[PDB]
Amino acid sequence: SMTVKLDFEECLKDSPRFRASIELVEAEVSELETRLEKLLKLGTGLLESGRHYLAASRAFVVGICDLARLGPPEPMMAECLEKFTVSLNHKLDSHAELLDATQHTLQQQIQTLVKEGLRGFREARRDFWRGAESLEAALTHNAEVPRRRAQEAEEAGAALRTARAGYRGRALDYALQINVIEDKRKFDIMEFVLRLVEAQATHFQQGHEELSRLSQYRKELGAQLHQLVLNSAREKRDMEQRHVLLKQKELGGEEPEPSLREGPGGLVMEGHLFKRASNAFKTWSRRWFTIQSNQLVYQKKYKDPVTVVVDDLRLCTVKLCPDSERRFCFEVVSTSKSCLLQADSERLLQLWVSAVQSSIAS
Amino acid sequence: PLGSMTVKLDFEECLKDSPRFRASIELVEAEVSELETRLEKLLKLGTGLLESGRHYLAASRAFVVGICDLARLGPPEPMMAECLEKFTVSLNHKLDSHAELLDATQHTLQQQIQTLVKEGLRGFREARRDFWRGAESLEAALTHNAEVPRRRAQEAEEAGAALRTARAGYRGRALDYALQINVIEDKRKFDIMEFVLRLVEAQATHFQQGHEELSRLSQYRKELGAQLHQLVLNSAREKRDMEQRHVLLKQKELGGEEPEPSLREGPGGLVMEGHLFKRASNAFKTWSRRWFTIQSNQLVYQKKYKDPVTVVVDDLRLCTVKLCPDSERRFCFEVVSTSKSCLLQADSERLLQLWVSAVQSSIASAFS
């Protein structure tokens, strides 16, 4: 609305316009301080959330390596993490440098401006208003002194003289400080924004050149992956076809037939049998039995401690049970102990019994 | 090809329905379940990344809004406006490209990782259920078989045939399962690699978009950097000129003199202006200092720069001026017109004599 008029002419004149000019400058510096401090506040916001973001990204790339760590070592997957994961980390480190550079201009341009950069202004402002107060006292005093008996008048004029000389110096100093911060405001803001831009450019250039050096590896991997996905789909089709022929022609539902094998340490055979418990419930249950080293043992699951049902199989005999309720029953009879077993078929029965018959041979 | 979740699966052990076969199925299930866990942990890490990223972009946008805020202050300058215009758009651009980057990152999390853990594992989970349903049916067919009575040759017939179909089903389902275990072994490697490839592509777009825009800005940056270093030199040169001047003003000039009212400007001839004390004119008793102007055939005064001018002498042709070396205050003089009278007081002897002959000269002049 108004033009500031703060040249030595208007200063020495001490006009209402000079006064209004000082008030205007004081208004626009006060908003300068408020708007620099808020930008520092927003600068803290940007930096604190930037660092959190980069920490999360860092933790994300680690998650990726943890994921791929599963399964066997696969050279192609490992070369892929080796190149890309160092590459994703590099962008995060370069981003961190960007936030550092951002912090640095905030301190170097903006923060010093509201602090040390405005000190001369605040001082001269202070000394000027101090001078305006004492001049306004000297003018009225020199005015209200009657003549009718006066030498305090003589001393009022000399006092007015020193208040004018003083006020004039302070108005000039203050005007000079105002011109200086006018220029400093301009260059410090423009250099501030130019440094933010130059730090973006360093960041985008480092990133873009590292990604560009991978351009070749990236296309070759894409070509590879797409071909592998196709080979896999074909291989899955083959398997599924084989499985159909297997189930329609070759599998069937015959009970497995444990083979009598000559192990190291005697005849070995393993296979499922039903067995009767020795407690009073006499519950029949299915177990995995093993004939090995002249012992008959069973387990429920793999790596279970064996229960030894027969101590020494060369102290026993084997018989059918024509006097039990369920089919395919047989008994292994030791000295004091006895054990009841059952096979799933007549075939399985005979196979097991001559297997035990044989493991009785010494 | 190579085995790995398939390395342990043994078709002979499956046909024997052996405990080692059962164990090898349980180990694959532990591996897939750990695969699910790590996939799930990755999604959650992705959420943390995305939510953090968005909050960071938002804080950044507000930082850029703050920069403009700051720069709109003060007397406007086209160099500053050009500066703020090019750069705030360019900084905002980087945030948009970055927002695009977070979008893409989320898109590949969804299509590769989240789709793997939900739908990608569906075949595995269905074949697993069918395999264990097969196991249970076998198991019931075996006990049922084992329990059929001595001379029930008919029920023996039926239990046997139910067992046979239960066994073949069991083996069929183990194969379907084996199949799905291979499939999942392949998805695992291809989908994670494709995922990481796509994060990289998304980075390259972002970095290429940011880099290109900033290079187009490159001569302007180097030119602005030049102009800026220039302005800071000028400003040092001018500041030295002003200190030189002020040292001259303090030294060369005043003994402490009041400003002498100044003559200036051509609005209706020349103008004269300066401070005077004025008694307010009805026995009020108030010596009030105001800024008087002789202007356009009038003597006028103001308190403030803004203040509408209040007229003291409507027409200088119709007024008189007279010294008052007889009054109670030093350096007084009076201005009378048809309607107004005004007692006026200067600050010194010399100003008194400046303002009165000034008025007389204004009076004589305006008859021209």
Side-chain angles (χ1 to χ4, degrees), chain A residues 52 144 168 198 232 247, chain B residues 52 176 186 221 257 329:
Chain A
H52 186 87
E144 277 173 320
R168 205 187 301 266
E198 286 296 320
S232 193
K247 304 175 194 163
Chain B
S52 261
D176 298 336
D186 283 5
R221 279 146 64 198
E257 290 215 27
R329 305 274 178 241

Side-chain angles (χ1 to χ4, degrees), chain A residues 85-100:
Chain A
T85 210
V86 174
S87 177
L88 293 161
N89 292 149
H90 165 85
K91 310 309 164 281
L92 269 15
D93 297 344
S94 179
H95 203 117
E97 299 170 29
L98 168 61
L99 294 175
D100 288 343

Side-chain angles (χ1 to χ4, degrees), chain A residues 32-47:
Chain A
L32 210 214
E33 269 156 0
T34 295
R35 287 170 192 247
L36 288 195
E37 302 269 54
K38 156 75 172 285
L39 202 250
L40 285 165
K41 204 199 135 194
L42 256 14
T44 300
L46 178 155
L47 273 27

Side-chain angles (χ1 to χ4, degrees), chain B residues 102-314:
Chain B
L102 294 181
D103 288 337
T105 298
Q106 174 162 55
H107 304 161
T108 194
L109 274 166
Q110 287 173 345
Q111 296 177 28
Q112 272 70 51
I113 306 288
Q114 189 174 58
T115 292
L116 224 204
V117 80
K118 292 164 173 223
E119 298 301 340
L121 281 175
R122 173 185 299 251
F124 173 93
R125 288 195 288 255
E126 287 175 331
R128 182 172 173 173
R129 148 265 271 170
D130 301 339
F131 170 81
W132 295 107
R133 189 190 327 108
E136 203 88 11
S137 304
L138 217 202
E139 207 68 355
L142 283 160
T143 61
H144 183 72
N145 186 236
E147 273 164 354
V148 286
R150 186 89 270 172
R151 308 296 79 180
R152 264 156 201 69
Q154 156 64 10
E155 261 206 60
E157 258 278 22
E158 282 185 292
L163 176 56
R164 285 200 161 263
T165 82
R167 178 66 59 177
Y170 183 71
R171 284 153 170 184
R173 295 298 187 184
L175 282 173
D176 298 336
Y177 204 177
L179 186 64
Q180 286 308 133
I181 292 162
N182 284 67
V183 162
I184 271 329
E185 186 97 274
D186 283 5
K187 286 201 131 282
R188 166 212 263 171
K189 38 199 211 93
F190 298 147
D191 291 7
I192 289 28
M193 278 191 275
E194 172 78 25
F195 166 72
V196 169
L197 185 51
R198 271 172 54 151
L199 296 173
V200 175
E201 289 298 329
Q203 297 286 333
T205 301
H206 165 63
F207 275 99
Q208 189 235 258
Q209 278 163 359
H211 177 64
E212 190 219 318
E213 146 92 12
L214 290 161
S215 295
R216 293 193 258 93
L217 269 186
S218 144
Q219 249 267 81
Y220 174 78
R221 279 146 64 198
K222 99 107 152 91
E223 279 154 350
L224 169 62
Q227 287 174 31
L228 232 39
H229 168 69
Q230 202 92 151
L231 268 301
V232 186
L233 245 62
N234 292 352
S235 184
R237 179 180 17 178
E238 281 162 340
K239 190 204 155 179
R240 310 255 281 291
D241 287 2
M242 275 194 77
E243 300 178 59
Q244 184 188 328
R245 173 179 277 137
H246 293 187
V247 168
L248 286 170
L249 274 173
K250 267 84 93 167
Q251 191 65 46
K252 191 198 194 88
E253 299 295 351
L254 79 154
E257 290 215 27
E258 281 298 286
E260 327 227 318
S262 83
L263 294 291
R264 41 155 283 275
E265 264 53 75
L270 195 74
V271 85
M272 197 182 97
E273 54 180 9
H275 283 289
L276 294 174
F277 283 92
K278 57 134 194 52
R279 178 192 283 281
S281 190
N282 203 317
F284 276 121
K285 269 176 155 64
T286 334
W287 290 105
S288 197
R289 182 161 170 101
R290 261 82 166 128
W291 189 250
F292 286 76
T293 308
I294 298 167
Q295 183 173 8
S296 307
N297 199 27
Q298 305 196 329
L299 174 72
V300 305
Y301 76 75
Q302 308 179 241
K303 184 166 51 164
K304 216 259 182 311
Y305 187 56
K306 98 101 215 187
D307 295 356
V309 154
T310 81
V311 186
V312 170
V313 178
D314 65 350

